[PDB]
């Protein structure tokens, strides 16, 4: 057979659209100055506002944001919300920034293909693929999208997007509780994008 | 014109078709210590197979139950009766009595599962509530002797966890491929290796248990 | 609804095209006159002459290398050469009937997000197909792999997969599966992080081991 003109199944379109807006977040602390915790973040708009997780940036002497295009910025902590575990950062917007695609009218459905985008184990930006496993998941009263897109240490604060590259949520947690000394597989949680956007707005207002 | 109709890649169709028929199964035993109150000892999943209210699950999920509870995704909850079980295949059949119509799992008796088929695993891992995971059919059985000790397991890498047992593995059309039963969990932690009873064998065993109870 | 006429989404085409060329590799050793399996992995038949790519770690210190095809044929393989720098090894089998070979499209450029299937023999369960995507196609800066040209994938890779094939939805070879990531930060288990040698490099290193050693 000759598959030369056949086209490989791919979610590269979503990657080209969304990945440039997902950044590596470095929590640096005085050693000189070294990296304590690392995670990911999402550039939400041209103003330079970034969503990440609170646990990623906690007790940082200096927060660094690294874009996939090679630019590195010092980020300022705008605010954080312990109820939802989100935090907002702010970098220099001058020079133009890639932003995450957002479709405010898209309703996430169970079974939708999703890609997780982040920096696990500081390997560099990593794309993994799963589906929305459940919606409306939760002491705690939180609302999560559940996904089996592989999520690891470093993915926190990163993006979960669909095949169109639209933001579905912010990856936050990985289930690791074991009844029988066995390990959970493919159970991860993200803050739905609508909730995250709301929390970001409040935090920016400082209210 | 300003709002176009591009839609994300999705297996939601399979979910809408199959998921309503997959139930959360609760094995409950009475406790001598606290007022003879019923409490959960094991939990798993099950599949509603026909309108009469017959349900497939794993035998090890319902072993030694004082009370078996079945919860549907629409919010209905029923007490189920054990119709029978088969230890050779680890399958069990339950029966509920419902007034309204019951959702049933799509079954295409002529569909032949193929290695590489997209599948969804549907169940209630860790009692988080119904969960859908996605993988493919990794294998449709084995000719040679192997560590499973069996020759007819569907192997899949759709993530399966504690609580998924008794639940459904379906294709992208929502058609039943198998009943999720095992996970390879200890060796190095294995990843993406799970096993289901093929739907053909599960249907034959069910009919047998409904007819005889053995 | 009546789905009898609908077609299930499937990568079975890729499977039928690529899987027959992926073999089970057995590293046998003496421990008495009787030989025992010491290590097991996978391999990929690259051309009709019987040259097979595998991982060097799989075949190191072997007293006898055995290659099993999915069609039931079993051969003793000869170690043609190994390259420590890339952890690749080349084997050679001598066969009469004609051999299945892995599809290779030299002009295909792997892209991040591409659907891929890993094909190998994890835990000696038998040939296993798992599905993921290309998570990354190399690295620009220094990173924990120490290398700059790994394909990274979340297609589930397990012990026994090393030396096996990573192909796209068309059955075209993308890489040779080599590493899976198990380094934990604080007790957690890494999930869906695996690595493969890109097919272009694998081809080149094979050609050089064949003629030189």
Coordinates of C-alpha atoms in Angstrom, one line a residue:
Chain A
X1 CA 0.0 0.0 0.0
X2 CA 1.0 3.6 -0.4
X3 CA -0.1 5.9 2.4
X4 CA 1.9 8.8 1.0
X5 CA -1.3 10.9 0.4
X6 CA -3.2 9.6 3.4
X7 CA -3.5 11.9 6.3
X8 CA -2.5 10.9 9.9
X9 CA -5.2 11.3 12.5
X10 CA -4.0 14.2 14.7
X11 CA -4.9 16.9 17.2
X12 CA -2.0 19.1 16.1
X13 CA -4.5 21.9 15.2
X14 CA -5.4 22.1 18.9
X15 CA -1.7 22.1 19.8
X16 CA -0.8 25.0 17.3
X17 CA -3.8 27.0 18.6
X18 CA -3.4 26.6 22.4
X19 CA 0.1 25.4 23.4
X20 CA 1.8 28.7 22.6
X21 CA -0.3 30.3 25.4
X22 CA 0.6 27.7 28.0
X23 CA 3.7 28.7 30.0
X24 CA 6.2 27.1 32.4
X25 CA 5.9 28.7 35.8
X26 CA 9.0 28.6 38.1
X27 CA 8.8 29.2 41.8
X28 CA 12.3 30.4 42.6
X29 CA 13.8 30.8 46.1
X30 CA 17.1 32.0 47.6
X31 CA 19.6 29.1 47.6
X32 CA 21.8 32.4 45.2
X33 CA 18.5 31.7 43.6
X34 CA 17.1 28.2 42.6
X35 CA 13.9 26.5 41.5
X36 CA 11.7 25.2 44.3
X37 CA 8.5 24.2 42.7
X38 CA 7.5 24.2 39.0
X39 CA 4.2 24.1 37.3
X40 CA 2.3 25.6 34.3
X41 CA 0.1 28.6 33.6
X42 CA -2.2 29.9 30.9
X43 CA -2.0 33.3 29.3
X44 CA -5.6 34.5 29.3
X45 CA -5.5 37.8 27.5
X46 CA -3.3 40.5 25.9
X47 CA -3.1 42.5 29.2
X48 CA -0.6 39.8 30.4
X49 CA -2.8 38.1 33.0
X50 CA -2.0 34.4 33.6
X51 CA -3.8 31.7 35.5
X52 CA -1.8 29.1 37.4
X53 CA -2.2 27.2 40.7
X54 CA -1.7 28.7 44.1
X55 CA 0.4 25.8 45.4
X56 CA 2.8 26.3 42.5
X57 CA 3.6 29.9 43.4
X58 CA 3.2 29.8 47.2
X59 CA 6.0 31.4 49.3
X60 CA 8.0 32.3 46.2
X61 CA 10.8 34.9 46.3
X62 CA 10.5 35.3 42.6
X63 CA 8.0 33.9 40.1
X64 CA 9.3 33.3 36.6
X65 CA 7.2 32.7 33.5
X66 CA 8.7 31.0 30.4
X67 CA 6.9 31.0 27.1
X68 CA 7.4 28.4 24.4
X69 CA 8.7 31.1 22.0
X70 CA 11.7 31.6 24.3
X71 CA 10.7 34.7 26.1
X72 CA 11.1 34.7 29.9
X73 CA 9.4 37.2 32.2
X74 CA 9.3 38.0 35.9
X75 CA 5.7 37.6 37.0
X76 CA 3.9 39.5 39.7
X77 CA 1.3 37.8 42.0
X78 CA -2.0 39.6 41.4
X79 CA -3.9 37.4 43.9
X80 CA -4.9 33.9 44.8
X81 CA -8.0 32.0 45.9
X82 CA -7.6 29.1 48.3
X83 CA -11.2 28.0 47.9
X84 CA -10.6 27.1 44.2
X85 CA -6.8 26.8 44.3
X86 CA -6.3 29.3 41.5
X87 CA -3.8 32.1 41.3
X88 CA -3.4 35.0 38.9
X89 CA -0.1 36.4 37.7
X90 CA 0.8 39.4 35.6
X91 CA 3.7 39.9 33.1
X92 CA 4.8 42.6 30.7
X93 CA 2.3 42.6 27.9
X94 CA 4.3 45.0 25.7
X95 CA 5.5 43.2 22.6
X96 CA 2.4 41.0 22.1
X97 CA 1.5 37.7 23.7
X98 CA -0.1 34.5 22.6
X99 CA -3.4 34.0 24.3
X100 CA -5.5 30.8 25.0
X101 CA -8.5 30.3 22.7
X102 CA -11.8 30.7 24.7
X103 CA -15.2 29.9 23.5
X104 CA -17.6 31.1 26.2
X105 CA -20.6 29.4 24.5
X106 CA -19.0 26.0 24.3
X107 CA -20.6 23.5 26.7
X108 CA -18.1 20.8 27.7
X109 CA -19.5 17.3 27.2
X110 CA -18.5 14.0 28.7
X111 CA -16.6 12.0 26.1
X112 CA -15.2 15.2 24.4
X113 CA -11.5 14.6 23.4
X114 CA -9.2 16.8 25.5
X115 CA -5.5 17.6 25.6
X116 CA -3.6 18.4 28.7
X117 CA -0.8 20.9 28.3
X118 CA 1.8 21.5 30.9
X119 CA 5.4 20.9 32.1
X120 CA 5.6 17.6 34.0
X121 CA 8.8 16.8 35.8
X122 CA 10.4 19.8 33.9
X123 CA 10.7 17.7 30.7
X124 CA 9.4 20.7 28.8
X125 CA 5.9 21.4 27.5
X126 CA 4.0 18.1 27.2
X127 CA 0.8 17.3 25.4
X128 CA -1.3 14.3 26.6
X129 CA -4.7 13.1 25.4
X130 CA -7.8 11.8 27.1
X131 CA -11.5 12.7 27.3
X132 CA -13.8 14.5 29.7
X133 CA -14.6 11.6 32.1
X134 CA -17.2 13.5 34.2
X135 CA -18.4 17.0 35.0
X136 CA -19.5 18.7 38.3
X137 CA -17.1 16.7 40.6
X138 CA -16.0 17.8 44.0
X139 CA -13.9 18.6 52.8
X140 CA -14.8 20.6 49.6
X141 CA -17.6 21.9 47.6
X142 CA -15.7 22.5 44.4
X143 CA -16.8 21.8 40.8
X144 CA -14.3 20.0 38.5
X145 CA -14.1 18.4 35.1
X146 CA -12.6 14.9 35.5
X147 CA -10.3 13.6 32.8
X148 CA -8.1 10.6 32.0
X149 CA -5.6 12.8 30.0
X150 CA -2.4 11.9 31.8
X151 CA -1.6 14.6 34.3
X152 CA 1.6 14.6 36.4
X153 CA 3.6 16.8 38.9
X154 CA 4.3 19.9 36.9
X155 CA 1.0 20.0 35.0
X156 CA -0.8 22.1 37.7
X157 CA -1.9 25.4 36.5
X158 CA -1.8 24.2 32.9
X159 CA -4.5 24.0 30.2
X160 CA -7.1 21.4 29.3
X161 CA -8.4 22.1 25.8
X162 CA -10.6 20.3 23.2
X163 CA -9.8 19.4 19.6
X164 CA -10.5 22.9 18.5
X165 CA -8.0 24.3 21.0
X166 CA -10.7 25.9 23.1
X167 CA -10.0 26.1 26.9
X168 CA -12.1 23.6 28.9
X169 CA -10.3 23.9 32.2
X170 CA -7.2 24.4 34.4
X171 CA -5.5 21.2 35.5
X172 CA -5.3 21.2 39.3
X173 CA -5.4 17.7 40.9
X174 CA -4.5 14.1 40.3
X175 CA -6.4 11.4 42.3
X176 CA -3.9 9.2 44.3
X177 CA -5.9 7.7 47.1
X178 CA -5.6 3.9 47.3
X179 CA -7.9 1.5 49.1
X180 CA -5.8 -1.6 48.5
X181 CA -2.2 -0.3 48.1
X182 CA -2.9 0.0 44.3
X183 CA -2.4 3.1 42.3
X184 CA -5.1 5.2 40.6
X185 CA -4.7 5.6 36.8
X186 CA -6.2 8.2 34.5
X187 CA -8.1 10.2 37.2
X188 CA -7.4 13.9 37.0
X189 CA -9.3 17.1 37.8
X190 CA -9.5 20.6 36.2
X191 CA -11.3 23.8 37.2
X192 CA -13.9 24.4 34.5
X193 CA -13.0 27.4 32.3
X194 CA -16.1 29.4 33.2
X195 CA -15.5 29.2 36.9
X196 CA -11.7 29.9 36.4
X197 CA -12.5 33.0 34.3
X198 CA -14.8 34.3 37.1
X199 CA -12.3 33.7 39.8
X200 CA -9.6 35.4 37.8
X201 CA -11.8 38.5 37.3
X202 CA -12.6 38.8 41.0
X203 CA -8.9 38.4 41.9
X204 CA -7.9 41.1 39.3
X205 CA -10.5 43.4 40.8
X206 CA -8.9 42.5 44.2
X207 CA -12.4 41.8 45.3
Chain B
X1 CA -23.2 33.7 9.8
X2 CA -21.2 35.0 12.8
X3 CA -21.6 31.8 14.8
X4 CA -20.4 28.8 13.0
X5 CA -20.9 25.1 13.8
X6 CA -17.5 23.5 14.2
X7 CA -17.6 20.9 16.9
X8 CA -14.9 19.2 19.0
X9 CA -13.9 15.6 18.4
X10 CA -16.0 13.6 20.8
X11 CA -17.3 10.2 21.9
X12 CA -20.3 11.8 23.6
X13 CA -22.7 10.0 21.3
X14 CA -21.4 6.7 22.7
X15 CA -21.8 8.1 26.2
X16 CA -25.4 9.3 25.6
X17 CA -26.3 5.9 24.2
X18 CA -24.6 3.6 26.7
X19 CA -24.0 5.4 30.0
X20 CA -27.6 5.6 31.1
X21 CA -27.7 1.8 31.3
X22 CA -24.5 1.5 33.5
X23 CA -25.3 1.5 37.2
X24 CA -23.4 1.9 40.4
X25 CA -23.6 -1.3 42.4
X26 CA -23.3 -1.3 46.2
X27 CA -22.6 -4.4 48.3
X28 CA -23.9 -3.7 51.8
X29 CA -23.5 -5.7 55.0
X30 CA -25.2 -5.1 58.3
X31 CA -23.0 -4.2 61.2
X32 CA -23.3 -5.9 64.6
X33 CA -21.4 -3.0 66.2
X34 CA -23.8 -0.1 65.4
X35 CA -27.5 -0.8 65.7
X36 CA -27.5 -3.4 62.9
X37 CA -27.1 -0.5 60.5
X38 CA -26.4 -1.5 56.9
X39 CA -23.1 -0.2 55.5
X40 CA -21.1 -0.5 52.3
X41 CA -18.4 -3.2 52.2
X42 CA -17.8 -3.2 48.4
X43 CA -18.8 -1.2 45.4
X44 CA -18.7 -1.7 41.7
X45 CA -20.6 -1.2 38.5
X46 CA -23.3 -3.0 36.5
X47 CA -25.0 -3.1 33.2
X48 CA -28.7 -3.1 32.6
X49 CA -29.1 -5.7 29.9
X50 CA -32.9 -5.7 29.1
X51 CA -36.2 -3.9 29.9
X52 CA -37.2 -6.6 32.5
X53 CA -34.5 -5.2 34.8
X54 CA -31.8 -7.9 34.5
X55 CA -28.4 -6.5 35.3
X56 CA -24.9 -7.9 34.8
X57 CA -22.1 -7.3 37.3
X58 CA -19.0 -9.1 38.6
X59 CA -19.5 -11.9 41.1
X60 CA -16.8 -10.6 43.4
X61 CA -18.6 -7.3 43.7
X62 CA -21.7 -8.9 45.1
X63 CA -20.2 -11.7 47.2
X64 CA -21.6 -12.0 50.7
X65 CA -24.0 -9.1 50.4
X66 CA -26.8 -8.7 53.0
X67 CA -28.2 -6.0 50.7
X68 CA -27.4 -5.2 47.0
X69 CA -28.2 -1.6 46.0
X70 CA -28.3 -0.4 42.3
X71 CA -28.2 3.3 41.5
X72 CA -29.0 4.6 38.0
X73 CA -27.5 7.8 36.5
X74 CA -31.0 9.3 36.3
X75 CA -31.2 9.2 40.1
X76 CA -33.3 6.1 40.7
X77 CA -32.2 3.7 43.4
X78 CA -33.4 0.1 43.7
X79 CA -32.7 -2.9 45.9
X80 CA -31.5 -5.7 43.6
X81 CA -32.0 -9.5 44.0
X82 CA -29.2 -11.9 43.2
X83 CA -30.4 -14.1 40.3
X84 CA -27.2 -16.2 40.1
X85 CA -23.4 -16.1 39.7
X86 CA -20.7 -17.9 37.9
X87 CA -17.3 -18.2 39.4
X88 CA -15.6 -19.5 36.3
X89 CA -16.3 -16.2 34.5
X90 CA -16.7 -14.1 37.6
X91 CA -20.1 -12.9 36.3
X92 CA -23.3 -12.3 38.3
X93 CA -26.8 -11.4 37.4
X94 CA -29.1 -9.1 39.4
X95 CA -32.8 -8.2 39.1
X96 CA -34.6 -5.0 39.9
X97 CA -38.2 -4.1 39.8
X98 CA -39.0 -0.8 38.2
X99 CA -42.3 0.9 37.4
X100 CA -41.0 3.2 34.6
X101 CA -39.0 2.2 31.6
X102 CA -35.4 1.2 32.2
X103 CA -32.5 2.3 30.0
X104 CA -30.7 -0.6 28.4
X105 CA -27.2 -1.1 27.0
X106 CA -26.9 -1.1 23.2
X107 CA -26.0 -4.6 21.9
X108 CA -25.1 -5.5 18.4
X109 CA -24.9 -9.2 18.3
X110 CA -23.3 -9.2 14.9
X111 CA -20.5 -6.7 15.7
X112 CA -17.0 -8.2 15.7
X113 CA -14.7 -6.3 18.0
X114 CA -11.3 -5.5 16.4
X115 CA -7.9 -4.8 17.8
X116 CA -7.5 -1.0 17.6
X117 CA -11.2 -0.1 18.0
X118 CA -11.8 2.9 20.2
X119 CA -13.5 1.9 23.4
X120 CA -14.9 3.6 26.5
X121 CA -14.9 2.1 29.9
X122 CA -17.9 3.1 32.0
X123 CA -18.1 2.6 35.8
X124 CA -17.8 4.0 39.2
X125 CA -14.1 4.0 40.3
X126 CA -13.6 4.9 43.9
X127 CA -17.2 5.9 44.3
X128 CA -16.5 9.3 42.6
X129 CA -19.6 8.8 40.5
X130 CA -19.9 7.4 37.0
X131 CA -16.7 7.9 35.1
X132 CA -15.9 7.5 31.3
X133 CA -12.4 6.7 30.2
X134 CA -11.1 6.1 26.7
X135 CA -8.7 3.6 25.2
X136 CA -8.7 1.0 22.4
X137 CA -9.0 -2.8 22.2
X138 CA -5.4 -3.9 22.8
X139 CA -6.1 -7.6 22.1
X140 CA -9.2 -9.8 21.5
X141 CA -8.0 -13.0 23.1
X142 CA -4.9 -15.2 23.1
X143 CA -4.1 -18.4 21.2
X144 CA -1.2 -19.3 23.4
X145 CA -0.9 -19.9 27.2
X146 CA -0.3 -16.7 29.0
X147 CA -0.2 -15.0 32.5
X148 CA -3.9 -14.3 32.5
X149 CA -4.5 -18.1 32.2
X150 CA -7.4 -17.5 29.8
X151 CA -7.9 -17.3 26.1
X152 CA -10.9 -15.0 25.6
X153 CA -10.3 -11.8 27.5
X154 CA -10.6 -8.4 25.7
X155 CA -7.5 -6.4 26.8
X156 CA -7.8 -2.6 26.8
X157 CA -5.8 0.4 27.9
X158 CA -8.9 2.5 28.7
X159 CA -8.1 3.3 32.3
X160 CA -9.8 1.0 34.7
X161 CA -9.8 1.3 38.5
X162 CA -11.3 -0.2 41.7
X163 CA -15.0 0.3 41.3
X164 CA -15.0 -0.2 37.5
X165 CA -15.7 -4.0 37.9
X166 CA -19.0 -5.1 36.4
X167 CA -19.2 -2.0 34.2
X168 CA -19.4 -1.7 30.5
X169 CA -16.7 -1.4 27.8
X170 CA -18.4 0.0 24.6
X171 CA -17.2 1.1 21.2
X172 CA -17.6 4.6 19.6
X173 CA -21.2 3.6 18.6
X174 CA -22.2 2.8 22.2
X175 CA -22.3 -0.9 21.5
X176 CA -21.4 -3.3 24.3
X177 CA -17.9 -4.9 23.8
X178 CA -17.4 -6.4 27.2
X179 CA -17.8 -6.4 30.9
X180 CA -14.8 -4.8 32.8
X181 CA -13.4 -7.3 35.3
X182 CA -9.7 -7.2 35.9
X183 CA -6.7 -4.8 36.1
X184 CA -3.1 -5.8 36.0
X185 CA -2.0 -3.9 39.1
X186 CA 1.2 -5.4 40.5
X187 CA 4.4 -6.9 39.0
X188 CA 6.8 -1.7 38.7
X189 CA 3.3 -0.4 38.4
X190 CA 1.6 -1.6 35.2
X191 CA -0.2 1.1 33.2
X192 CA -3.1 0.7 30.7
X193 CA -3.6 -3.0 31.0
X194 CA -7.2 -4.0 31.8
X195 CA -9.4 -6.9 30.9
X196 CA -13.1 -7.4 30.1
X197 CA -15.3 -10.4 29.5
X198 CA -16.4 -10.4 25.8
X199 CA -20.1 -9.5 25.4
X200 CA -21.0 -12.7 23.6
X201 CA -19.9 -14.8 26.6
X202 CA -21.5 -12.4 29.0
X203 CA -24.8 -12.7 27.2
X204 CA -24.7 -16.5 27.1
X205 CA -23.9 -16.7 30.8
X206 CA -26.6 -14.3 31.7
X207 CA -29.3 -16.1 29.8
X208 CA -28.2 -19.3 31.5
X209 CA -28.3 -17.8 35.0
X210 CA -31.8 -16.3 34.4
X211 CA -33.1 -19.7 33.1
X212 CA -31.5 -21.9 35.8
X213 CA -29.8 -19.7 38.3
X214 CA -26.7 -21.8 37.9
Chain C
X1 CA -31.3 4.1 16.9
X2 CA -29.9 1.3 14.7
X3 CA -26.1 1.4 14.7
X4 CA -25.7 -1.9 12.7
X5 CA -24.8 0.1 9.6
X6 CA -22.5 2.6 11.4
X7 CA -18.8 2.0 11.5
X8 CA -16.9 2.0 14.9
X9 CA -14.0 4.4 15.1
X10 CA -10.9 2.3 14.9
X11 CA -7.1 2.2 14.3
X12 CA -7.3 -1.4 13.2
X13 CA -6.1 -0.4 9.7
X14 CA -2.8 0.7 11.3
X15 CA -2.7 -2.5 13.3
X16 CA -3.1 -4.8 10.3
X17 CA -0.4 -2.8 8.5
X18 CA 2.3 -2.5 11.2
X19 CA 1.7 -5.2 13.9
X20 CA 2.7 -8.2 11.8
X21 CA 6.2 -6.8 11.6
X22 CA 6.6 -6.3 15.3
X23 CA 8.2 -9.3 17.0
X24 CA 8.6 -10.6 20.5
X25 CA 12.3 -10.7 21.5
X26 CA 13.5 -13.2 24.1
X27 CA 16.9 -12.9 25.8
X28 CA 17.7 -16.4 27.0
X29 CA 20.6 -17.4 29.3
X30 CA 22.1 -20.4 31.0
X31 CA 21.6 -20.8 34.8
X32 CA 22.5 -25.6 33.8
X33 CA 22.4 -26.8 30.2
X34 CA 18.8 -25.6 30.2
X35 CA 18.2 -22.1 28.9
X36 CA 15.9 -19.7 30.7
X37 CA 14.3 -16.4 29.7
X38 CA 16.2 -13.6 31.5
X39 CA 14.8 -10.5 29.7
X40 CA 12.1 -10.0 27.1
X41 CA 11.3 -7.1 24.9
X42 CA 10.0 -6.3 21.4
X43 CA 11.6 -5.7 18.0
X44 CA 10.7 -4.4 14.5
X45 CA 11.5 -6.2 11.2
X46 CA 12.8 -3.4 9.0
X47 CA 13.3 -5.2 5.6
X48 CA 12.9 -8.4 3.7
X49 CA 16.5 -9.5 4.4
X50 CA 15.6 -10.2 8.0
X51 CA 17.2 -7.2 9.8
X52 CA 15.4 -6.3 13.0
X53 CA 15.7 -3.3 15.3
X54 CA 15.5 -3.7 19.1
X55 CA 16.8 -2.1 22.3
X56 CA 20.3 -2.8 23.3
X57 CA 19.3 -3.3 27.0
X58 CA 17.0 -6.1 25.9
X59 CA 19.7 -8.2 24.3
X60 CA 22.8 -7.5 26.4
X61 CA 24.6 -10.5 27.8
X62 CA 22.3 -13.0 26.0
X63 CA 23.5 -16.5 25.4
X64 CA 20.7 -16.9 22.8
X65 CA 18.4 -14.4 21.2
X66 CA 15.0 -15.7 20.1
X67 CA 12.6 -13.8 17.8
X68 CA 8.9 -14.7 17.6
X69 CA 6.6 -13.4 14.9
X70 CA 2.8 -13.0 15.3
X71 CA 2.3 -15.5 12.5
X72 CA 3.7 -18.2 14.7
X73 CA 7.2 -18.5 13.3
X74 CA 10.2 -18.6 15.7
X75 CA 13.8 -17.9 14.7
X76 CA 17.1 -17.7 16.4
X77 CA 18.5 -14.2 15.8
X78 CA 22.1 -13.1 15.3
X79 CA 23.4 -9.9 17.0
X80 CA 24.5 -7.7 14.1
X81 CA 25.6 -4.7 16.2
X82 CA 24.6 -2.4 19.1
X83 CA 25.0 1.3 19.6
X84 CA 25.2 2.4 23.3
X85 CA 24.7 6.1 22.4
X86 CA 21.2 5.5 21.2
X87 CA 20.4 2.2 22.9
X88 CA 19.6 0.6 19.6
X89 CA 20.6 -2.9 18.5
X90 CA 20.2 -4.7 15.2
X91 CA 19.4 -8.4 14.8
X92 CA 19.4 -10.7 11.8
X93 CA 17.2 -13.7 11.1
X94 CA 17.6 -16.2 8.3
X95 CA 14.2 -17.0 6.9
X96 CA 12.8 -18.8 3.8
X97 CA 9.1 -17.9 3.5
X98 CA 9.2 -14.2 3.2
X99 CA 9.0 -11.7 6.1
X100 CA 6.5 -9.0 7.1
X101 CA 8.1 -5.6 7.2
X102 CA 7.2 -2.3 9.0
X103 CA 5.7 0.4 6.9
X104 CA 8.1 3.4 6.6
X105 CA 7.3 6.7 5.0
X106 CA 10.6 8.6 4.8
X107 CA 8.9 11.9 4.0
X108 CA 6.3 11.8 6.8
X109 CA 7.1 14.5 9.5
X110 CA 5.8 13.5 12.9
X111 CA 3.8 16.3 14.5
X112 CA 2.9 16.8 18.1
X113 CA -0.7 15.8 18.7
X114 CA -0.5 12.9 16.1
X115 CA -2.4 9.8 17.2
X116 CA 0.1 6.9 17.7
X117 CA -0.1 3.3 18.7
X118 CA 2.6 1.5 20.7
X119 CA 3.1 -2.2 19.7
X120 CA 5.1 -4.6 21.9
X121 CA 4.9 -7.4 24.4
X122 CA 4.4 -6.0 27.9
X123 CA 4.9 -8.5 30.7
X124 CA 4.9 -11.3 28.1
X125 CA 1.1 -11.0 27.8
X126 CA 1.4 -11.2 24.0
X127 CA 1.5 -8.5 21.4
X128 CA -0.3 -5.5 22.8
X129 CA -1.6 -2.3 21.1
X130 CA -1.9 0.9 23.1
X131 CA -3.0 4.3 21.9
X132 CA -1.8 7.8 22.7
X133 CA -0.4 10.8 20.9
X134 CA 3.0 12.4 20.3
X135 CA 3.5 14.5 23.3
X136 CA 6.7 16.1 22.0
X137 CA 9.2 15.7 19.1
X138 CA 12.5 16.5 20.6
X139 CA 13.8 19.3 22.9
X140 CA 15.7 22.5 22.3
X141 CA 17.2 22.9 25.7
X142 CA 18.9 20.6 28.3
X143 CA 16.3 18.3 29.9
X144 CA 16.1 15.2 32.1
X145 CA 16.5 12.8 29.2
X146 CA 19.9 14.2 28.5
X147 CA 19.0 14.1 24.8
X148 CA 17.5 16.4 22.2
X149 CA 15.7 14.1 19.8
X150 CA 13.3 11.8 21.7
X151 CA 9.7 11.5 20.6
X152 CA 7.7 11.6 23.8
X153 CA 4.3 9.8 24.0
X154 CA 1.5 9.0 26.4
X155 CA 0.7 5.7 24.6
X156 CA 1.0 3.3 27.6
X157 CA 4.4 1.7 27.6
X158 CA 5.4 -1.1 30.0
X159 CA 8.3 -3.5 30.6
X160 CA 8.4 -5.6 27.5
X161 CA 7.6 -2.8 25.1
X162 CA 11.3 -1.7 24.6
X163 CA 12.5 -2.3 21.1
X164 CA 8.9 -2.2 19.8
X165 CA 7.2 0.1 17.3
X166 CA 5.4 3.4 17.7
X167 CA 3.3 4.0 14.5
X168 CA 0.7 6.6 13.4
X169 CA -2.9 6.0 12.4
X170 CA -1.6 5.0 8.9
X171 CA 0.7 2.2 10.3
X172 CA 3.8 4.3 9.4
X173 CA 6.7 3.9 11.8
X174 CA 7.3 7.0 14.0
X175 CA 9.8 5.6 16.5
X176 CA 11.2 2.7 18.5
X177 CA 9.9 2.6 22.1
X178 CA 12.8 2.8 24.5
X179 CA 12.2 4.4 27.8
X180 CA 9.4 4.9 30.2
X181 CA 9.6 7.4 32.9
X182 CA 9.5 6.2 36.5
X183 CA 11.3 8.9 38.5
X184 CA 9.0 10.0 41.3
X185 CA 9.2 13.4 43.0
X186 CA 7.6 12.4 46.4
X187 CA 6.0 9.0 46.1
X188 CA 3.6 9.5 43.1
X189 CA 3.7 7.3 40.0
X190 CA 4.5 8.8 36.6
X191 CA 1.7 8.1 34.1
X192 CA 1.7 8.4 30.3
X193 CA 5.3 9.6 29.9
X194 CA 7.2 7.4 27.5
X195 CA 10.0 7.9 24.9
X196 CA 11.0 6.6 21.5
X197 CA 13.9 6.9 19.2
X198 CA 12.7 8.8 16.0
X199 CA 12.4 6.5 13.0
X200 CA 14.8 8.6 10.9
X201 CA 17.6 8.1 13.4
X202 CA 16.7 4.5 13.9
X203 CA 17.0 3.9 10.1
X204 CA 20.4 5.6 9.9
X205 CA 21.9 3.8 12.9
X206 CA 20.7 0.5 11.6
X207 CA 22.3 1.1 8.2
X208 CA 25.7 1.9 9.9
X209 CA 25.5 -1.1 12.2
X210 CA 24.8 -3.4 9.2
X211 CA 27.8 -2.4 7.2
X212 CA 30.3 -1.6 10.0
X213 CA 29.1 -3.3 13.2

